[PDB]
Design a protein around this nucleic acid. Structure first.
Ligand SMILES: [Zn+2]
Length: 56
RNA sequence: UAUCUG
């Protein structure tokens, strides 16, 4: 078998403004001062283990 | 009630 806990959802997403994403803001928490790559909320990356080498 | 799109 294979399951973690029910759940049965999935979505990519489209239309979605990038707010006032400042050149010195965070595109993760939405903070200002640190970058997403420097987001203090980021535990460890990369995130999303998807072995799909077909897109380029 | 699962945020790196810059
Ligand atoms: Zn952040």
């Amino acid at each position: 078998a294979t399951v973690v806990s029910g759940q049965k959802q999935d979505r990519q997403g489209g239309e979605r403004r990038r707010s006032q994403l400042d050149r010195d803001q965070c595109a993760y928490c939405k903070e200002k001062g640190h970058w997403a790559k420097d987001c203090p909320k980021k535990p460890r990356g990369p995130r999303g283990p998807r072995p799909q080498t077909s897109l380029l």
